[PDB]
Amino acid sequence: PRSLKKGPFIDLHLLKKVEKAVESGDKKPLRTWSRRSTIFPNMIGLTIAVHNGRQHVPVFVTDEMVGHKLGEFAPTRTYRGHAA
Amino acid sequence: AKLHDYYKDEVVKKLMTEFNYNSVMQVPRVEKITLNMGVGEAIADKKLLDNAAADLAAISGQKPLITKARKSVAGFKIRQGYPIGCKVTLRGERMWEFFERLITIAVPRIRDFRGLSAKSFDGRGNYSMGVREQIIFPEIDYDKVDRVRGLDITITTTAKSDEEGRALLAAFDFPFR
Amino acid sequence: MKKDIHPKYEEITASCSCGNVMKIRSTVGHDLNLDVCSKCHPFFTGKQGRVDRFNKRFNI
Amino acid sequence: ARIAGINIPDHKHAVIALTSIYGVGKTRSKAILAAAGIAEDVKISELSEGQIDTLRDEVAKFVVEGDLRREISMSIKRLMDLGCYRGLRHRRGLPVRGQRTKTNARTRKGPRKPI
RNA sequence: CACGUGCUACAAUGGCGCAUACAAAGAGAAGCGACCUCGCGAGAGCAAGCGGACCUCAUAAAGUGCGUCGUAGUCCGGAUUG
Ligand SMILES: [K+]
Ligand SMILES: [K+]
Ligand SMILES: [K+]
Ligand SMILES: [Zn+2]
């Protein structure tokens, strides 16, 4: 995991968007490709659509989700089982 | 003895106030405690039932009564009159001594004890609980235990309802989650 | 009680770490030393997130 | 003899015997013994009841047995409820730490299941 | 799910603890980095030396002595998961 001294990593563009959305009010889901960005407390109650490589997957941030990367909640590979 | 003395000295007064009972006879009493072991494995081996009986005897302090199948059951591969369990009925002094031992020593010795369910009343004020391991009872020796045997304990009460039953047990500070 | 069919049942002294001593009838016969009892057991005594975690670890 | 609601082996040395407790490994076992002032080589049978009580106090400091199991269960449950990648791996009974699944992964998957 | 090539084991000709011997070959400047301090540790800070038979990587390990474990799914194994 990222060293504590470096602090949590977030893409600047996502941070700006989140701040604007929080200030604005309840907003349409934010569309981001930043799967690597850590989920922050301010994000809670916001819906962020995270790219999974082919589509943006809506994620409603919750308190438990905080401290996890956005990509964790958007699955990249599709598998419905062999011989299914 | 002590718990019986406690019942008369304290429990009656607390219950009388709580339920506004007209008479002392109205106050719920612990009629009996029945300890049962269902030894299905006995059908394969007779000795297992004997060992279970010996364990129940040590815990109860009383020789157990062997129970036998009421009717033949294909599912369990049992025929009527085949011994498949043992029980002891505890009354009076022996009951109160067991009740004390259970609350004071055995229940604490239960692994990962987080309290007993208060929803285990049968609807008529009688409380049933299961013991997963005979080890909890101090009389049983961990070193000499051939097999882990559980038992089911039922406390029969003169309580008309579950609320009266739970109150009676609560008065004795029976552990409840 | 019937005679000669029951286990011997005599008063024994049970001692605990908390120091509670109880004299009870039992088939055990020998005096018992107990790790725990009703008096000292945590349940009886009553002795028995992410947002906060984030703030503590990553306070800026 | 009886610590943390379990029976530790009397014949074994204390350092080994303590590891029988869930949540106690060799390191914690050594730490507990050092705090209790009991030598690692000493057998549990040899220890006095007072010595056993000191051990019990030391064990109480660490989360162990049922309490630990509850914590572990909650942590896994949280992940599965979250629906995070790790949670999904727990649900499917597949490796959670990015190991290969094309071959191996038998510990998580279990015995090979013929097509 | 099937196969190939490996690694680690299933222990006592071993495991673990402590103490203590004996190599070769090689690499290094957006590099090798000592010492000292700090951290259980991975490391961190500070900071020599060395473009090298000079300084650094860098500890050889098996071994040996002593102690312990005593044939157990173990003081074997170290997968898996928090
Ligand atoms: K352990
Ligand atoms: K993978
Ligand atoms: K390999
Ligand atoms: Zn006590």
Instruction: From residues 32-51 of D, list those within 7 angstroms of strand E by Cβ.
Output: 41
Range of the domain at A59: 2-82
Beta bridge partners of B85: B38, B67
Q: What is the 3-state secondary structure (H, E, C) of C3-60?
A: CCCCCCCEEEEEEECCCCEEEEEECCCCCEEECCCCCCCHHHHCCCCHHHHHHHHCCC
Beta strand pairing call for B83-90 and B30-38 = antiparallel
Cα–ligand 2 centroid distance for A30 (angstroms): 29
Domain count, chain A: 1
Please say whether the beta carbons of B9 and B24 come within 8 A: no
Q: What are phi and psi of B58, to 5 degrees?
A: -65, -40
- Solved how? cryo-EM
CA distances from C16 to C9, C21, C38, C39, D2 (A): 21, 6, 10, 9, 13
Query: Measured between alpha carbons, how far is D66 from D86 in angstroms, rounded to an integer?
Result: 24
The CATH number that applies at residue D53 is: 1.10.8.50
Q: What is the resolution of this structure in A?
A: 1.9
Strands of A47-51's sheet, edge to edge?
A: A30-32, A47-51, A56-60
Q: D54: part of which helix (H) or strand (E)?
A: helix D49-61
Within chain A, where are the H helices? 12-24
CA quadruple A23, A24, A25, A29: dihedral sign: negative
Would residue A74 be called left, alpha or beta, if left means φ above 0 and alpha means ψ between -120 and 50 degrees? beta
Could you say which DSSP state residue B128 is in?
A: E
Angle at B48 between CA B47 and CA B52, to 5 degrees: 115
Report how many Cβ contacts below 8 Å link chain A to chain C.
23
D28 touches strand E (CB under 7 A): no
Task: Please name the residues in contact with B23: beta carbons below 8 A apart, sequence gap of 6 or more.
Answer: none
* Of A81, A68, A73, nearest in space to A29 by CA: A73
* Of B34, B50, B132, B58, nearest in space to B83 by CA: B50
Query: Measured between alpha carbons, how far is B62 from B33 in angstroms, rounded to an integer?
Result: 12
Range of the domain at D50: 2-65
CA quadruple C20, C24, C26, C30: dihedral sign: positive
CATH of domain B3-172: 3.30.1440.10
CA distances from A76 to A68, B13, B82, D13, D99 (A): 16, 68, 61, 51, 16
Chain B positions with Cβ closer than 8 Å to D: 109-114, 135, 142
Residues found in chain C: 60
* Of D100, D4, D101, nearest in space to D52 by CA: D4
